């Protein structure tokens, strides 16, 4: 029963729930389902639901997801990939959306802005959610995680030295392969913004674009003012607010 | 959206849904949530939902689950274990129950005979459903599956010759492992019936009881009239109706 | 019929055949039978036959072999080991040589560098070809393959998580096992060159030499100028021409 | 070199060869290639090449194969199936035919009369030899082997009690699955005779026919006088002699 999954936290009035290690906010509305995924918090800051305020006044159904809860000594998330390095976490997010949302998948929109954009794509490309509107996702996931936390990377690489560099490359290409194995025949509505001064994520975007091209998937991109900063974030929020409206 | 998960099939008064390969019936009621698990169909018979008619006049919330849909050559189920021999399928069942049921965990009952009772044990012991009322579960799962379908056991075993033995003990002990790792502090309410003349499954029960015993889990067992037949099933049906009320 | 095995391709003066997935060149000559094994191609280059031009003016019988054609994603070969990690592919090579060559076993020479020398060792040690003249073979096969292509090693490793470690040591030690089980009574004529500055493969050679040593197999080793480069290859070519004549 | 594979035996003038454990006779002719497979000899009688005399006066290319050489304490053959229970022995037979025969596969004819007929089908259905003319093959291979030799059956079932009944059923259905996975689009020319008083093998024939029907393969059958005896054998030989001529 949904209310027995409550964790006791409340965020801007919204009660937090947890199911199979997957923490989420849920509010039942009408007409559209908005889904947001959490981005990478600063070191020692708890994971945040992002882009609640953008929909507080809305009448839409709203869900907001956090990342996994491990490694415990740097619990900032493993990029929506399980510690078994498979889809188990995405699978749970999918069940939650499919059973609580009151709209079909074409009236559902996935949002997220860094790690959160990667989460949005991983879910959308696995389970065919067509509308994905994200900012500056990472493409080489393990390369990036290495710059932010050895604790998380080493947790995900595993204890066996023989498989660490294998797991490294598997994590690194985890998103790219989701593109390589997605449906191609779906009418995707993927929008990816990125700050014009975000040199690092513009090169990540080129990498993602190539993989879509190989798969014959058209996406929309838009450079916005700013870099890897809140100027870009501010413009991302205005961008997705117009697309949904 | 639940409505969008409909398969189009309607078994007795109840619509069928599918989510992540998991086919299920569901009807909203009150007071209690009844869960049933499909048992192993005879050869060339499709997987059936079990113990629907028992609860059509109950007004309880009711869910009934089929087993996995692979291997397609003998699609009678893999004992609720995925092709990767993990919890992925049980995890989907859990989400469906947790989000659709409108009663507490202690007001929820897992029912099943034969393979269905294995599924009830696997779900209940993995995710702490305390009320489990089942008849003649197998204990050594691979030993039993091979006497019914070499195709299914071969499918679960995998392709590599030099891992067919390892995976065999892993499948064989998959239920026993769940007992070994379950939470001994839960106020377990496990009832297992078995036909008096069902010597095979009488011994499986002792195998199971030894694992419960050493985890300090006290269960209720009742010998009923019959063997591995529909006499025992009829007495099993009478037993779980009596306990539920 | 051999003529019916033609692929239609003709590399230099020699027609290509395929039998049971095994692509090979063959030209009938006299006095000696020369066998070469393809080495590991750089990324996105197709598998090439090696050391053809060395013998175009020789009038010797000549056969050149490619590696397996899988995985199709990175089809550069599986170190002459089948997808079932057994001798099936080496066994096909053996039949082709035994039935097409017109000279004794002692007048037959197995050539190859890098992965090609591994293939020469695997064939010669399995089926008693005494004359083996190779440069810088790997010893720990999986350790090396993972530094060139995660796809190929994953393909050889298989799908089950709980067998990726077992199969890794099995692949890694597949050549060393052939040494452990070869016939010590054969009048082995094994020559292994290695570049003086090829530290990685200098150590692989010591690993190999230790296995030969304890099987009482005396081999000839020669340090040549160069490292893991085309200098060493040129001196390797000069070495095997000198030995053959 | 073919002549170095000689075993030292000579049968009706024909020198015997051996390659990878596979013993064969070979004579090079023109126009057609005739292949025969050995049948199950009496206990303590060595395996025989069958139907040599039928082609001694012919000008055709001729090959005759025996079965595997294990188990050593009842070396009457394991039905052309390796002790690894795979295609390795058929693979060797195929290489030998493909590299020594001077005709294409449509001018090649596979003959055999009991176990030998099964060998003929196993090779023909695996490697697409269209012309297969056999008498009274077994369908349930392990059921039959059980009546002739516990030593051979136990050797093939393997030492692990857990896999003995799995290996039993795999061996039993080894032929049926060759039918289930064969090409269907090939223009098969399969002729199966059987003695009208061979009640046991007429029921084996019905089983084989069904599997062909499911696969949409037309075959030709012919009842001949005799039972499981030389009267039937005599008529089988006249039958295949007219079909080839
Ligand atoms: C840009 C950002 C700061 C905007 O914040 P915002 O304008 O307040 O809007 P949000 O809808 O995200 O609301 C967050 C609010 O809910 C709070 N909140 C969010 N998750 C919470 C949680 N698990 N527990 C308690 N409070 C939470 C936040 O602290 C904040 O409340 P506040 O008013 O006290 O600050 C935020 O959306 C964000 O950081 N996004 C990710 C940026 C990125 O992509 N990358 C940076 C790392 S490379
Ligand atoms: C007892 C049993 C045989 C039948 O009992 P029952 O009186 O029919 O009661 P149920 O509630 O189980 O009825 C199932 C109903 O749902 C129908 N149904 C179930 N699954 C269905 C499906 N995929 N599609 C269509 N109909 C389905 C059945 O056809 C049946 O309807 P009907 O008989 O009226 O036509 C059944 O419960 C069963 O198979 N139990 C298994 C016991 C066991 O241990 N089996 C393994 C032995 S080794
Ligand atoms: C030395 C080397 C680089 C080239 O030497 P070379 O002077 O060209 O002599 P080779 O006899 O090997 O020539 C091969 C010829 O056959 C051709 N050939 C080989 N395989 C072919 C194929 N499938 N299709 C078409 N052509 C093919 C080649 O194109 C080449 O012909 P070309 O150069 O005249 O056009 C080659 O032998 C080689 O790759 N060796 C591998 C050494 C090694 O260790 N590699 C792995 C390093 S980690
Ligand atoms: C029917 C059969 C006896 C006919 O024998 P045949 O008329 O002499 O014709 P073949 O072409 O088969 O020639 C066999 C000859 O070569 C000999 N020969 C065959 N294989 C031999 C071998 N490995 N080593 C030495 N001699 C061999 C045979 O002994 C015989 O020689 P012989 O004249 O001394 O008797 C024989 O073909 C046969 O037994 N076929 C199998 C019958 C069957 O299908 N099932 C019975 C078991 S259920």
In chain C, residues with a C-beta closer than 8 Å to the C-beta of A169 are 150
Comparing CA positions, the residue from B177, B50, B194, B51 lying closest to residue B125 is B177
CATH superfamily of the B2-244 domain: Alpha/Beta hydrolase fold, catalytic domain (3.40.50.1820)
Distance CA B172, CA B178 (A): 12
Distance CA A29, CA B176 (A): 44
Could you tell me the two tokens for C54? 């060395």
In contact, B221 and B205? CB cutoff 8 Å: yes
How do strand C6-11 and strand B33-37 relate by DSSP bridges?
Answer: unpaired
How do strand A61-65 and strand A33-37 relate by DSSP bridges?
Answer: parallel
In contact, C119 and C65? CB cutoff 8 Å: yes
Helix (H), strand (E), coil (C) string for A109-124: EEEECCHHHHHHHHHH
Residue in C52, C56, C145, C230 to alter for ligand 3 test, most ligand atoms within 8 A of Cβ: C52
Beta partners for residue D221, in sequence order:
D192
- What end-to-end distance do the CA atoms of chain A give, in Å? 33
Q: Give the distance from CA C133 to its chain's centroid.
A: 10
**From which experimental method does this structure derive?**
X-ray
Distance CA B194, CA B202 (A): 7
Q: How many CB atoms lie within 10 A of CB C90?
A: 21
Q: Give the distance from CA A158 to its chain's centroid.
A: 23
Which run of H or E residues covers position B243?
helix B230-244
Distance in Å, alpha carbon of D99 to nearest chain C alpha carbon: 5
Q: B58-61 long-range contacts, Cβ below 8 Å, gap at least 24?
A: B58/B29, B58/B32, B58/B34, B59/B29, B59/B30, B59/B31, B60/B29, B60/B30, B60/B31, B60/B32, B60/B33, B60/B34, B61/B27, B61/B28, B61/B29, B61/B30, B61/B32, B61/B33, B61/B34, B61/B100, B61/B101, B61/B102, B61/B103
Could you tell me the two tokens for A57? 């006044």
Please name the residue of chain B whose CA is at the shortest distance from the CA of residue A2: B99
Q: Give the distance from CA C80 to its chain's centroid.
A: 7
Comparing CA positions, the residue from B5, B23, B111 lying closest to residue B75 is B23
Please name the residue of chain A whose CA is at the shortest distance from the CA of residue B105: A1
User: What is the Cβ-side half-sphere exposure of residue B8, based on CA atoms within 13 angstroms?
Assistant: 0
Comparing CA positions, the residue from C9, C229, C115 lying closest to residue C123 is C115
Residue nearest to ligand 3 atom 28, measured at CA: C48
In contact, B53 and B27? CB cutoff 8 Å: no
Secondary structure of residue B18 in the 3-state scheme: strand
CB-based burial label for C109 (10 Å; 0-12, 13-18, 19+):
buried
Q: In degrees rounded to 5, what are phi and psi of residue A194?
A: -170, 140
Interface test with C, best of B161, B162, B177 (most C CBs within 10 A): B162
Give D238 Cα–ligand 4 centroid separation in angstroms: 16
Report CA torsion sign: B77, B82, B87, B90: negative
Give C51 Cα–ligand 3 centroid separation in angstroms: 7
List the Cα angle C21/C22/C28 in 5-degree steps: 145
How do strand D33-37 and strand D131-135 relate by DSSP bridges?
Answer: unpaired
The residues, ordered by sequence, that sit 6+ positions from A28 with a Cβ below 8 Å of its Cβ are A61, A100, A102
In contact, C185 and C152? CB cutoff 8 Å: no
Q: How many CB atoms lie within 10 A of CB A98?
A: 21
Q: Which ligand is nearest to the CA of D237?
A: 4
Distance CA C80, CA D215 (A): 34
Distance CA A35, CA A52 (A): 10
Rg (C-alpha) for chain D, rounded Å, is 17
Distance CA B62, CA B56 (A): 9
| Residue A64 alpha carbon, nearest atom of ligand 1 | 20
Q: Is B53 annotated as a binding residue?
A: yes
Residue nearest to ligand 2 atom 2, measured at CA: B50
Q: Please report where in the chains the tokens 């693979």 appear, as a residue.
A: D91
Secondary structure of residue A130 in the 3-state scheme: coil
Q: Please report where in the chains the tokens 């961008």 appear, as a residue.
A: A239
Q: How many CB atoms lie within 10 A of CB B210?
A: 13
In contact, C29 and C60? CB cutoff 8 Å: yes
Give B62 Cα–ligand 2 centroid separation in angstroms: 15
- DSSP secondary structure letter of residue B102: -
Beta partners for residue D132, in sequence order:
D110, D190
Distance CA B63, CA A222 (A): 47
Could you tell me the two tokens for B61? 């919330």
Residue nearest to ligand 4 atom 38, measured at CA: D50
Distance CA C41, CA C18 (A): 19
How do strand D22-27 and strand A131-135 relate by DSSP bridges?
Answer: unpaired
In chain C, residues with a C-beta closer than 8 Å to the C-beta of D84 are 86
* Angle of the D161-172 helix axis to the D141-148 helix axis, nearest 10: 110
Report CA torsion sign: C123, C129, C130, C133: negative
CB-based burial label for A190 (10 Å; 0-12, 13-18, 19+):
buried
Distance CA C233, CA B11 (A): 72
Interface test with A, best of C44, C143, C146, C151 (most A CBs within 10 A): C146
Contact: C170, B163; criterion CB under 8 Å: no
Q: Kindly list the protein residues whose Cβ atom lies closer than 6 A to any atom of ligand 1.
A: A 9, 11-12, 39-40, 46, 48-54, 113-114, 230, 233
Kindly provide the residue ranges of all beta strands, DSSP E only, lying in D104-200, ordered along the sequence.
108-112, 131-135, 189-195
Contact: C103, D1; criterion CB under 8 Å: yes
Helix (H), strand (E), coil (C) string for A5-53: HEEEEEECCEEEEEECCEEEEEECCCCCEEEEECCCCCCCCCCCCCCCH
Contact: C154, A162; criterion CB under 8 Å: no
Distance CA B209, CA C99 (A): 63
Q: Kindly list the protein residues whose Cβ atom lies closer than 6 A to any atom of ligand 3.
A: C 11-12, 39-40, 46, 48-54, 113-114, 233
Which run of H or E residues covers position D7?
strand D6-11
Secondary structure of residue B49 in the 3-state scheme: coil
Which run of H or E residues covers position D137?
none
* Angle of the A161-172 helix axis to the A141-148 helix axis, nearest 10: 110
In contact, B104 and A1? CB cutoff 8 Å: yes
Could you tell me the two tokens for A189? 């509505």
Please name the residue of chain A whose CA is at the shortest distance from the CA of residue B127: A20
Contact: B146, D166; criterion CB under 8 Å: yes
Distance CA A199, CA C77 (A): 38
In the sheet that holds A189-195, the strands lie side by side as: A6-11, A14-19, A22-27, A61-65, A33-37, A108-112, A131-135, A189-195, A220-224
Could you tell me the two tokens for A54? 């953008």
The residues, ordered by sequence, that sit 6+ positions from B90 with a Cβ below 8 Å of its Cβ are B80, B122, B123, B126, B127
Q: Please report where in the chains the tokens 């990767």 appear, as a residue.
A: B84
Distance CA D39, CA B46 (A): 42
Please name the residue of chain C whose CA is at the shortest distance from the CA of residue A169: C150
Distance CA A171, CA D154 (A): 47
Residue nearest to ligand 1 atom 45, measured at CA: A114
Comparing CA positions, the residue from D50, D43, D40, D49 lying closest to residue D78 is D40
Binding positions of A for CoA: 47, 49, 51-53, 113, 237
């Amino acid at each position: 029963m949904l209310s027995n999954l409550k964790t006791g936290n409340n965020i801007l009035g919204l009660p937090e729930f947890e199911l199979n290690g997957c923490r989420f906010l849920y509010k039942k509305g009408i007409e559209k389902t908005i889904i947001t995924f959490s981005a990478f918090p600063p070191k020692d800051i708890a994971q945040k639901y992002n882009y609640i305020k953008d929909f507080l006044s809305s009448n839409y159904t709203f869900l907001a997801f956090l990342d996994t809860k491990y490694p415990e000594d740097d619990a900032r998330g493993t990029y929506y990939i399980t510690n078994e390095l498979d889809n188990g976490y995405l699978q749970t997010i999918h069940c939650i959306i499919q059973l609580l949302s009151n709209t079909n998948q074409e009236d559902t929109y996935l949002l997220g802005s860094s790690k959160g954009g990667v989460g949005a794509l991983l879910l959308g490309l696995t389970y065919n959610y067509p509308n994905i509107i994200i900012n500056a996702p990472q493409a080489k996931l393990a390369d990036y995680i290495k710059t932010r936390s050895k604790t998380i990377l080493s947790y995900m690489l595993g204890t066996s030295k023989r498989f660490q560099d294998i797991n490294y490359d598997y994590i690194n290409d985890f998103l790219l392969s989701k593109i390589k194995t997605c449906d191609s025949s779906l009418k995707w509505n993927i929008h990816i913004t990125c700050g014009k001064d975000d040199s690092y994520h513009l090169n990540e975007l080129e990498i993602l674009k190539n993989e879509f091209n190989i798969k014959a998937i058209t996406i929309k991109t838009k450079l916005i003012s700013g870099g890897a900063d809140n100027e870009a974030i501010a413009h991302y929020r205005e961008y997705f607010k117009t697309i949904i409206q």
